[PDB]
Design a protein around this ligand. Structure first.
Ligand SMILES: [Cl-]
Ligand SMILES: [Cl-]
Ligand SMILES: [Cl-]
Ligand SMILES: [Cl-]
Ligand SMILES: [Mg+2]
Lengths: 509, 509, 509, 509
């Protein structure tokens, strides 16, 4: 009954996958923990199985990774970049089958599965350039005969815990940057995307092996809360990068702080689009639709709140309704499909509960709101009007395609309503007004980590630092100087002179 | 019997101090909490009194500071820099009496009290430059017709909790940078340096008032653990900068993390000097003496571990003992005095406790070890030989002038011994060897935030970022890009084109 | 008959000026060249005399400056910054009388004379911050056991030749930055602002002398084309910063290039304001008036071309005409005056010549065009319509308040018309259109060094790099990384390892 | 008799070369100028022919390149980076045959021909990273309601004139950087490496055409001084990057300055190695040998002056002589060969002239000094002792393997002797002394653009800016912020507020 044993899924074996897969890699493959089966969310059929990490596997792997670091940190950063360049090429060679696996096991449409691998590929090439650039300034000392230099050095072992919904690119953004910065990595992906984690690790492991480097430089320990909690408490994990829910990330952040470790937290979002009276509606309507229903509403950057100026609210809602009806639903890997399943049946339950709560709280479902009657975890993309902007359910991140629509009149109030929630990931205004745009970008504007104009809430690219504020946790990935989170700064004074310190009346020899 | 009522301390009134002083400033002066008397540690005589903050004082002050922020954040950063320039000049005008007050209330020698004010003065002038420079890059977007900009904006209210031992400069470093970054400040200094906090706040208040700015931009709430804990828990404190012990800072860090605030932690040190066989001993011996006994061993950067190559260990110890015997002890304001008292009577008891534990664990006191028979909190500067490097007492920060001396043979082991403690603030090697110097600066070298060569563990200047790693807490102050900790980064994509997104087969209006 | 001998102008002595002044400073004051008398352009009366540099003076001064450099370059940059900080304070103390001298000898209104000194003061404070920041990155070498560092070091002697119209601030921007970068300076100002040059040099000389530094660090050799040509040809002048006409600057550039020196060229402008149909006309009209008539049209950044969309052309011209009639003319040191005299009688004659040329080429004088009926070099601020945008006189920089007005219809054509002249200093558009703004800032937009939006052509501040492209010469002053022009870059590889190169089959010992 | 018509050289056809090759590419291939034949310097046999550019070819190519720029500058920099990435891959695929062509037509050994292609490959990958990074800062304006941004835009057409001795990598460093900065390029290579220029252009043209981009983005006009002089005088060539002799580059620099263009000059070297008394002689002797004789002394970074402390001078010379005798001479494609021919017979004549001049100026040839009796342009690598450090011939760059050896005693004199020549490219000291190393790197140290320690004068890598000072011309290539030379800076103030300027007593409408 496993999909991997059916001839039409034989392409899975191009990624090195089998009926039962080892979920631990440290140079050798293994796994003594519980065996997990992952399921295709489009049809609820089992794909294949992964043997997860026991405690003993975790111990063995952390030790091997930290021994590997002694070799890896001695490799000049540009030569570490060459390894990352080869990882990029190795991903390129498997981009179609890896993207297909992302679609099969996670459930996003094929163009987004492929696009996720391409993002990892492109971050590799960015990191190759960074590998010749990272460092700090040489500064003019106030002391004669002294140099003053800012050095940056790897922190050591970077633990990377990732979420189900970007099962390739979040790891990749952390991996590429941590690697060129001289760190070794230990990955614990989401249990429901274990095959993706194994497949990516097979690709990287071959590059490391072909370059005669210890594979534990990019270690893997598949598991769930058990392994993740161990990483959060483990003093040997010098930096823990955690992408996931605010609820879990809060506890991870506390555990890392308890041991004076470093954490990089990429947590929940509740992202608003604001359409002012002067907005180009032919831009607003498709922008809101694709940002709200993309990935079936399961992006951290998904648009979940849409504020529309009262003068245009009804027209925008009507136009969105007509466009929602045209969304093409199907298997996520099938041609021209725009909309696939939610990742789990529990996500369907949370969807239904939020729709019910919105209705009981005075909202009107103007489109969608129901489960779809087909195999897998499909729900209708949903638009809710009439709720108060401070309704409890509107302030909650429900990881599903529910778009709460609100009216506003004035700029100051709607900026405050963007900022009033606990999350702080992405935000967008649609307007032509020059002053409003720079106020939005200013100290009295959006409080989010991503602050966009005339592009919706998923508007981000690898050249910038990606992340959020407030309960989104404060970490950054990929661009700008995000690399500094993966290294330790030292401020270094070098006395190269023959000068002696003042004796201060003491008779020294 | 208050020193401020005695003729030879009449200079205290030049700072605006009187017998009983208001310890709350938010534009108005007040203080309805407990009245604290601070004492001169050189003679245990009371100086004057300060009315501390009640809960109601704290609440009123936080609200007024956040109201002032609405005004302050709208002032262009270069004009904020002009205010910080005037603060610098106002400190210059009072540098002698303020330095004298540091010597009187805190107990460090006069040149260091004056020197502490000078560092604040110099940070002000550095911040004036920064006020025309802070910001982020404009990046090349991959998207046609889009701009990509990294913006930086103030976090809002920066709470600043400071230690007794640098009662002017730690606050000043945070104040000057936080101000040009567009933040308002709330200061809670050490209770035993309350008069210093009041005096500094009087200087700043006059500058703000002369510029017709709300005084709550630089608010003061004197108090102890009650006020500091409230700040740690207060969601209105956007960044909490904490300088203090690791024990207290750990709890502050956890409380801030619990509420997804920002913390900047500057915690304990256990700083090593390492002298290799090729070291210039005429440089090593005075360097170690002044870095170990300076400020009576009460700098966070004090040298507390001295590793000496076995070939020169006995010679260096003998030379140190002969030099320690020449240290000039007396009132810290008297001319040519090098060595004053410890800050508190509790510090004297902690000193004696550590000396006893050192003896139990196998160490030998070769110089000092006892309380001096004189008024005030004077203890002998102390040298202990023969302890194992991993002795529990050697791994502890005892904030007293106790220098633990160790032998070593090879570079790899002694670098490891530098790194093996939980603290990670400052570190120094003395050597002539070019390769050893660059290895010390590299990934297998010192793990501290300050990594020095042929200058001891207090070698730092305002152009660099100041702080440590590990249990020193990770925060940075003053130079390089430390300013970014006082601001929030946004990555901003601006679509300025008339281009519409691809319709993806949906028919839009 | 000298103004300095009349009681009405006795304040001139507060600047150390006498009836006859030494125009050479190299630590000693002297001048064996021709004695020049400078005149007040508001009343054509002689002010006082300056003894200019002979060739022997020039030779002696260059030698003393280069000897002084040996001392100055050994002073740590932050301590050089402290000298520059004190220069800023000394300027502050004389700001009113020095600004008054700028008004008296050069002729601009008092607020602009004072404002020029204030700009120098604020550049000093900027440079104080830079003095702790200048330097380059430490980069990750591809070679094991090697460091790679980018160093910056002073070029040596920076010659500074300046124009009459900013007789304080151009020198100051070069002086403050060159000084913190470790260079010594040699100033040759405009002959007609010799008293200003002497007065500034007296202020700086006292600071240097008070700090026990050789005065030749900021040397002065007053003179005309002969001294300027000598500097252009002198291999001992490592960097020649030249501010002045394109005609003279072209020759200075060729002379410096012939000897493989460095030049920093700040040459002529022909700056355009473009008002689009959507512009705020209540912003456009005052912006254009003040940018066109400010300093009697004698700024390098003066607006000389005004392109107005055809739909609003007639209205904007009518509003400009009504406002020009209200310009208040008089002695530039009187506070109601917006508008002072031109700098020379020749300038008045050239104004008249340009007006006649504009009429010959088909232009209509709609306001002004004539000399004013009063003593001093006063001309009417002048507006000319009906010329072709490619009229010869419109493409010429005439240093007089003549504003040439043109119609346009389309964005691409008017951007091209902005760009079609040989000058490339400043440019401004007035518009509300977001896309037009970013196209103006982009690769098909303005070709100038200053590219402004809704602020006119004088919109610049010290935090940015100031300068132009094309025949404006390409140099930059003040902000961003302009400091790099005053230093030499080295890319430094340091092998700190014991590794030997591969023998490649050769037998070495 | 053409090598390309012989079966042993059929591999040349892998580069698309034939008996007679078009030497003009602008999207179409042509060439109506003179047909040049290039010869193998190892045996003086003709290889193949190239049809060079006539004036009409040049004029059409410049126009086509500037038309192509309209498309290219509108492509986002990251997407321009993607093109450069594919150029790197296309070079990778041809690296062996292209390296072999460099050895055949230029004459350097095969590992260096391949290594030159590899440097271009790695610059492409570095540029891919930079394509997401280039830009300037957003700065904090002193003006309320204004933004201040530093923009960078392409200059347009970058003409690239290259020397014979790095016929791939110099072009590639300029091409990759100019391309990601949004410029189109026009290449005129050395006439004696025309086949290399054609082969590289064939590789790039295929990438451009495969991407449906106009081929004139990377245009080629093969020719000699006629085309190069036309480029130097052509106002349509916005930046002219020139690599070549100081003698030619001086005139190029003057012609570009005459038209207020931009030049990037990479001119001659006269690079010194200095061996101090404490140097590692097992490091010095091989370092000096390989840096002096590598590429038969035809690197711009070749070591030409060797200063040895008097205490070790005779020993180092004796060891160098014994090592020179082991240099393996032969065909530069033969695997066992270290030393091939000079590039031309004129180079042989210049070598002989310099050897006899050195003897006439008092030098002694202690090794070599003769032409080799064999086919091709072979001369003996040569060592000359006994010249004064200021002998005219030692101050001249003779592009041939002649090493002039000098004694010295003290550091200050030998630093001055490094600096006393007109050239300023590279420089190296060998020493263990920490203070001497930092003095060498400081303001009283080396005046060159490359300043090395314990690595010889060819020690450079792509992460750093490459170039020299003084008569080396000042330009930089490849790393750090060298990219700014290929773009134009604008300083942009944006008033986004509704604020109007102060009326200054004028009543506007
Ligand atoms: Cl001693
Ligand atoms: Cl629509
Ligand atoms: Cl040898
Ligand atoms: Cl008006
Ligand atoms: Mg003139």
């Amino acid at each position: 009954t496993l999909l991997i044993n059916q001839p039409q899924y034989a392409w899975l074996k191009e990624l090195g996958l089998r009926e039962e897969n080892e979920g631990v890699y440290n140079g050798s493959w293994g796994g003594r923990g519980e065996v997990i089966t992952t399921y295709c969310p489009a049809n609820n059929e089992p794909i294949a199985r992964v043997r997860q990490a026991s405690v003993a596997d975790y111990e063995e792997t952390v030790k091997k990774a930290r021994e590997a670091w002694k070799i890896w940190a001695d490799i000049p950063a540009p030569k570490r970049g060459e390894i990352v360049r080869q990882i990029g090429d190795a991903l390129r060679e498997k981009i179609q089958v890896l993207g297909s696996l992302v679609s099969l096991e996670m459930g996003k449409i094929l163009v987004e599965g492929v696009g996720e691998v391409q993002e990892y590929v492109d971050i590799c090439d960015y990191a190759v350039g960074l590998s010749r650039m990272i460092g700090g300034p040489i500064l003019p000392s106030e002391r004669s005969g002294h140099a003053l230099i800012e050095q940056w050095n790897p922190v050591g072992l970077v633990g990377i815990i990732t979420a189900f919904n970007f099962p390739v690119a979040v790891y990749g953004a952390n991996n590429a940057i941590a690697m060129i910065c001289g760190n070794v990595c230990l990955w614990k992906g989401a249990p429901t995307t274990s095959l993706i984690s194994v497949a990516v690790t097979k690709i990287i492991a071959k590059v490391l092996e072909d370059n005669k480097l210890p594979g534990a430089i990019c270690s893997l320990t598949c598991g769930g809360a058990d392994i993740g909690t161990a990483m959060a408490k483990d003093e040997r994990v010098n930096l823990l990068s955690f992408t996931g829910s605010t609820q879990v990330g809060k506890q991870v952040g506390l555990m890392v702080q308890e041991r004076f470790g470093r954490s990089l937290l990429e947590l929940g979002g509740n992202n608003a689009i604001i359409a002012f009276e002067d907005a180009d509606l032919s831009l607003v309507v498709p922008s809101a639709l694709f940002a709200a229903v993309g990935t079936a509403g399961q992006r951290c950057t998904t648009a979940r709140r849409l504020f529309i100026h009262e003068s245009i609210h009804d027209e925008v809602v009507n136009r969105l309704k007509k466009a929602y009806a045209q969304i093409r639903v199907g298997n996520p890997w099938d041609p021209n499909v725009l909309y696939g399943p939610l990742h789990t049946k529990q996500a369907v339950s949370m969807f239904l509960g939020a729709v019910e709560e919105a209705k009981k709280e005075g909202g009107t479902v103007v489109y969608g709101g129901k489960v779809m009657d087909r195999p897998g975890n499909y729900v209708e993309p949903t638009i809710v009007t009439g709720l108060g902007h401070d309704a409890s359910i509107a302030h909650t991140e429900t990881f599903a395609p529910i778009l709460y629509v609100f009216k506003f009149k004035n700029e100051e109030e709607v900026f405050a309503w963007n900022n009033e929630v606990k999350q702080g990931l992405s935000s967008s205004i649609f307007t032509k007004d020059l002053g409003r745009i720079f106020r939005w970008l200013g100290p009295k504007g959006s409080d989010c980590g991503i602050v966009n104009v005339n592009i919706p809430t998923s508007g981000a690219e690898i050249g910038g630092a990606f992340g959020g504020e407030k309960h989104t946790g404060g970490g950054r990935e990929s661009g700008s100087d995000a690399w500094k989170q993966y290294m330790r700064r030292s401020t270094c004074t070098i006395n190269y002179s023959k000068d002696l310190p003042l004796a201060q009346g003491i008779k020294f020899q």
